[PDB]
Design a protein around this ligand. Sequence first.
Ligand SMILES: Nc1ncnc2c1ncn2[C@@H]1O[C@H](COP(=O)(O)OP(=O)(O)OP(=O)(O)O)[C@@H](O)[C@H]1O
Ligand SMILES: Nc1ncnc2c1ncn2[C@@H]1O[C@H](COP(=O)(O)OP(=O)(O)O)[C@@H](O)[C@H]1O
Ligand SMILES: Nc1ncnc2c1ncn2[C@@H]1O[C@H](COP(=O)(O)OP(=O)(O)O)[C@@H](O)[C@H]1O
Ligand SMILES: [Mg+2]
Ligand SMILES: [Zn+2]
Ligand SMILES: [Zn+2]
Ligand SMILES: [Zn+2]
Lengths: 502, 338, 97, 592
Amino acid sequence: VDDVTGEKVREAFEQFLEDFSVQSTDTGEVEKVYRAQIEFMKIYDLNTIYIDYQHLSMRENGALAMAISEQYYRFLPFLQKGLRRVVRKYAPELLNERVFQISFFNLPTVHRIRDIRSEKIGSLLSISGTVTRTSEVRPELYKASFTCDMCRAIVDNVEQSFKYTEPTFCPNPSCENRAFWTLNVTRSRFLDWQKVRIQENANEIPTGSMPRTLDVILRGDSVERAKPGDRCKFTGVEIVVPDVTQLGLPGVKKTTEGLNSGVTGLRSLGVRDLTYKISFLACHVISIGDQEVFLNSLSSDEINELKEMVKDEHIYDKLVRSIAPAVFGHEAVKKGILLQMLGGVHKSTVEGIKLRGDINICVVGDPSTSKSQFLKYVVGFAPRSVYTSGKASSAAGLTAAVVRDEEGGDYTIEAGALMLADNGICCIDEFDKMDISDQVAIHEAMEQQTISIAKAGIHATLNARTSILAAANPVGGRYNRKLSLRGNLNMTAPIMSRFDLF
Amino acid sequence: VEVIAYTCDQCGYEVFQEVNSRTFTPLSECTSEECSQNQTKGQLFMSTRASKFSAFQECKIQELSQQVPVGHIPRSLNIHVNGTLVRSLSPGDIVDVTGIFLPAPYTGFKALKAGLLTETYLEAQFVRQHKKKFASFSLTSDVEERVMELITSGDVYNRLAKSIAPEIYGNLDVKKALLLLLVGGVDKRVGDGMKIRGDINVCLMGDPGVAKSQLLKAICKISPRGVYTTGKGSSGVGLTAAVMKDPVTDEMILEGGALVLADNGICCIDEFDKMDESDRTAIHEVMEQQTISISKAGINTTLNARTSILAAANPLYGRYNPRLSPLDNINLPAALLS
Amino acid sequence: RVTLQEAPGTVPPGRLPRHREVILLADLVDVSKPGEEVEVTGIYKNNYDGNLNAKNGFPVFATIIEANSIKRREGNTANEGEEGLDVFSWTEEEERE
Amino acid sequence: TNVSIQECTTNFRNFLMSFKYKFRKILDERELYYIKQLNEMRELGTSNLNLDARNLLAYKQTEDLYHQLLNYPQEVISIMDQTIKDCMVSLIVDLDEIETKFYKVRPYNVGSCKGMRELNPNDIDKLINLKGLVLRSTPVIPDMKVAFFKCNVCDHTMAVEIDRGVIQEPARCERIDCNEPNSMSLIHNRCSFADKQVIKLQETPDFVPDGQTPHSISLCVYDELVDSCRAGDRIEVTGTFRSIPIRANSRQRVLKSLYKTYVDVVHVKKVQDLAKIREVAAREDLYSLLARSIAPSIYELEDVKKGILLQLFGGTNKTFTKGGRYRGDINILLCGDPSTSKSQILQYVHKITPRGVYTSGGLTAYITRDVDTKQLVLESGALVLSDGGVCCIDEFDKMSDSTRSVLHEVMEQQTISIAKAGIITTLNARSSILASANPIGSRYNPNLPVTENIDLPPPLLSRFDLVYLVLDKVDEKNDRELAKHLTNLYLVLPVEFLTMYISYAKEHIHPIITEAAKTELVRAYVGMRKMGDDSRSDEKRITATTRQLESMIRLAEAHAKMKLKNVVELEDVQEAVRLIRSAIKDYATDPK
DNA sequence: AAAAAAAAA
Ligand SMILES: Nc1ncnc2c1ncn2[C@@H]1O[C@H](COP(=O)(O)OP(=O)(O)OP(=O)(O)O)[C@@H](O)[C@H]1O
Ligand SMILES: Nc1ncnc2c1ncn2[C@@H]1O[C@H](COP(=O)(O)OP(=O)(O)O)[C@@H](O)[C@H]1O
Ligand SMILES: Nc1ncnc2c1ncn2[C@@H]1O[C@H](COP(=O)(O)OP(=O)(O)O)[C@@H](O)[C@H]1O
Ligand SMILES: [Mg+2]
Ligand SMILES: [Zn+2]
Ligand SMILES: [Zn+2]
Ligand SMILES: [Zn+2]
């Protein structure tokens, strides 16, 4: 039976892929977004395509856009066939036969996790939440090839499902596939696979209710695109996953209350009941929370402004004036912070001795004279910058710590602020009240750029390439002009030699 | 279940079955004539309305401490009860149960061991509740003449104080304070919703060996709502429900933040300085009829604590000191003392 | 066979390491030691597994690494002076020199 | 049974068109609800009908249908829904909106509310009414309704209806042109499903008189009842009773001798005023009455009440790009001996404010290990939950040490970051703090300064917006006044109108300061700078900090916030300076 | 469920 509806939607899809012909600007008379895209894949040998849902909106109105969005699972192979048809009409050698992928983006609205209901199963949807855990990138069987052992005939292109399925017949007339098949690994094609977990934000959750959790499955080029702790927006199709354990498998076989929506009466089920649960499949992920290389990023403004502020006569006189316009006064501190941001060259000796190539600055003064403002500005301006306090509630503190679950084989280290501040600027506030362990680890952290630890059977040497900036309050509240830095401050002499400017 | 009935999809009579075993198996085909015909006519389905059911309950009983031989651990016994006698007994009473002592198969565990060893249980037939009855002072003629006699007795509270603990000598004022504690103070709120409690909180101080512990035990005996607790020793007495992780299904039954019968209860504590920070926080939380709202997993079923607090303690020196008495105090924060 | 983690100096800070399984054939036995950071050249292979499919609900395959060469990289991070599995080994002409 | 099908429908339809609640009015002994509500649904498009049993009981022919509904709920409800479906055409004589929507009823108040401690087997498959408190919920559970099958040889598909869950699989394809028996394999993602959800409910504590333990009963819901309740809700439900055999061993067809009990419910119940604002907002002495209204039982202490009310009003918040955000929250400390009833003020303000968490001396996010389910979930803390509101803290001195540093980063930056178990993220707090502390010892000695008695770090104390002191001293007059006042209590207050006014002020009012008040601000700053030095070169303490400037600015902006003003006036700045220097005048130690 | 070793408070 020919699903002419699928054929019609595929024909319309390939049609507006052919002749979308939207214009971007006046100079862009006819630009052909998807022809340019296919040329892009031609010149960079890619496999995925991106389709804007709004660009899909006006084509045939809801007879096409809605007919694709709602029964997406029903018409996905038809869209794949249309894409293959157009690409092999316009670019044969690109096929060199490959798993083309389509990612729809820019949906009209996003849904909360608490708004998920079964009536949208198989329909395109957009959801967002915080990623709390991911998994490894495992290979997954997609198209299998099998050998008919008793006759060694080949049956291939066997589509798979939630269960590992073998063929059911042999084309050889003399054979009747009484014996089973052996999988041809070098003939089958695998695809990447990763499972991530999401949950509702604190904004949507009312009262002290328990957050709702959902499981999202990635596939293709979207692997490792959602790191834990990130609020991201997922676009994909809602699906349902069964319990494969009750399903036939070669291997051996809140919850105690049961009352699940089981089903019985099938052949392979036997006397078992099949259960289901809701999971989401994603195809597009976005997040909402050398000098020649730089010169390669060419633009008119890139050339003009760079040349202008290189050939100027009074860059410095202006440059220091451009740092932290909010604060009042404190001319020298701005220059010091600018020099700290610029940094120093890093060199290594011929025999492998390393040289410290950064600038460490301490700021001292009586309370309320706008010292924390500089730290906040540099945190908000310098990339890979971390704000932290002298006294930290975490066991990591500043450098690192070791933790293990009670009678659980972890033996894992936890990263301190200095560890997170790698290749950046660490900003410590209230430097005075540190404790002994950090106070003795620091004067190794700065000068040697590395931290070493050996506790309870685990030893390691971690990189700590950081530029430090600290603030302090003189003992007694107000700085005593009669005495010196050593007299007023209680911080130790060896730490004093570490710093470069005051 | 006693008799299990199946419907036959409008095929004549609806097949019945009765199973007296503790396991049950269903039917597959039916004796209906058109169903007995050589092709299938409808799948038989169990009918809930047509079946006959019965109430079922189980309980276990322990040996009395007087009957245990020396150097042994008391044993238990399982009791099954069915019918109209269900819910005729409550935990924590002495009973005289008569029943039939029956064996029970081990095959329910399904271990394929103990070829001749079997489990045993008793099926209840008649229960004598025994023990005593509180009766909630339900008025009867005899107690009416009793209260008439009390009216004729004149002044009563002095005799009541004299009659609580004659084994402990003297200390008339302490017993008078105990009487005043038993009745309770002004209660049932005031205008515009301001909270007032009728409970009285009295703390007793003294050196060891003054029979204050014995007096506390006598008070607990005479007060039907009295409860005795102490710092640890038993863990399920403070900040945790008595049913936590209790059911065999491990259903995690819990109220959250609650104490032992703190609603209209008389809490008695010895060694008031002994308890750790958790029980100290609980006793500070139960202040002035304040409810306990400690949450752990989204639970907020607070226990409305309206209790009178009676505690006995001693200074760490073990003897009174000539120096400033607040230096002896209770070794507790002054806010709790006030 | 042995369990291989990620080097703490290579993992991005604040993240979790990734575990793999390494299989050592003859002549490779006891060459590596617990706690010693190593570098293994080997062959990547995949195979079927039951409970991995059971718990994931998808035809996922387990992967192991059949080792072919092992080089110790504990302490001495300077890895540019000379090439070879062991930089502390000498030839006959080097002995003559 | 075969009795209700014919005449009960006609009788109930007749009393549907012929019902007047005047019958119930006469029954009470101190109007066509159905038709008017049905036309309301017709003009609304909503498909929902509520039905009370007592009005259903008010008619003599209907009580027979009442008894029949008690015994046989499902069939009666189905025939009632069919009757209501036909009522569409019966009353409209657009027929297009009718054919798409289904219709259902919500019976309630059928029987008296019973308890889980008395549930005999005689009450199986009978409608009952239950109250309780929700313990836990569950995610939506799909439920198969239409099975989808495909003949893979010829790619032919068909839809198979189901019944009682069990699927009668077709053993041979309907297309006799191929007629293959083994060519069917279903599609999981092309079926149709229903949204079932399970709710765990506990009984009310009123049913336990003698220290027993509560018992839990499971619930089942469908469609509109999904997510209709959450944790901690107090609700009442009406529905039928159900009993099910348990599978025990999933490998075999053996069944236990005991049945699991659960209930299925159909109805659940829980447990232009802007003109009224401006009339009140235009009054002159609204400030004093508003300040005194939030604490009716508190005697005197007017200035602290004004300060707390202004803090509740809150200042403005701005996030200009090139300079960054500025704090808009107000943080107040209270100190004094435990003879002030200062906990009562915290309890008042916790419930007066829209959002606010009342805690004691954990407070922020920590990764938790889930109890009932075996997974790891990130959980937020109390301080995060008070975003935009006021966070109340009691017993501030007993704060330990690890948590204090947390506060030190929640006030100067109002953004907390957590880096644990591979999770690195930042959370917004934007919360106000109202804390109380006690002195060390039985009394706060006036000679000793504040810092020693409170036992707090000087920087944390300094970074508060304001601070207030209470010193109960024994005098005849004030003791007499308190005695009379409290005895009279022992023997002009608004309503949630206050809450809606606060919400309107927080949402729609964004006042700014003006150039006129700038001169007064500068003059006040100079004035307190002028007092900071004297005729001696001792370099007296510099009490005119920039924190004073920001405190004045926020207090003035909040003083423009209430009364629904849009720009500041002088009264704002004089009020701010007076209320900020009143505490400073009582901040001195024994000298001077 | 109960004993024994480790790092941080
Ligand atoms: N007034 C008294 N009359 C009779 N016996 C008394 C009296 N005071 C103390 N005793 C005796 O003291 C014992 C009970 O006092 P006990 O030492 O248990 O109380 P306590 O002061 O709470 O001390 P501790 O904390 O050491 O238990 C009994 O042996 C009792 O006979
Ligand atoms: N432009 C400015 N000039 C002078 N002081 C400022 C300026 N902006 C902010 N301030 C003040 O400086 C303080 C910055 O914090 P900081 O200097 O660390 O004092 P503290 O140690 O009391 O936090 C703020 O409290 C603010 O009142
Ligand atoms: N001005 C007052 N008006 C009414 N009651 C008061 C007043 N001052 C004290 N009280 C009474 O004294 C008690 C003081 O307790 P409080 O100081 O709040 O304890 P804490 O501060 O340790 O929680 C209150 O319970 C209150 O009933
Ligand atoms: Mg004692
Ligand atoms: Zn073959
Ligand atoms: Zn039949
Ligand atoms: Zn066919």
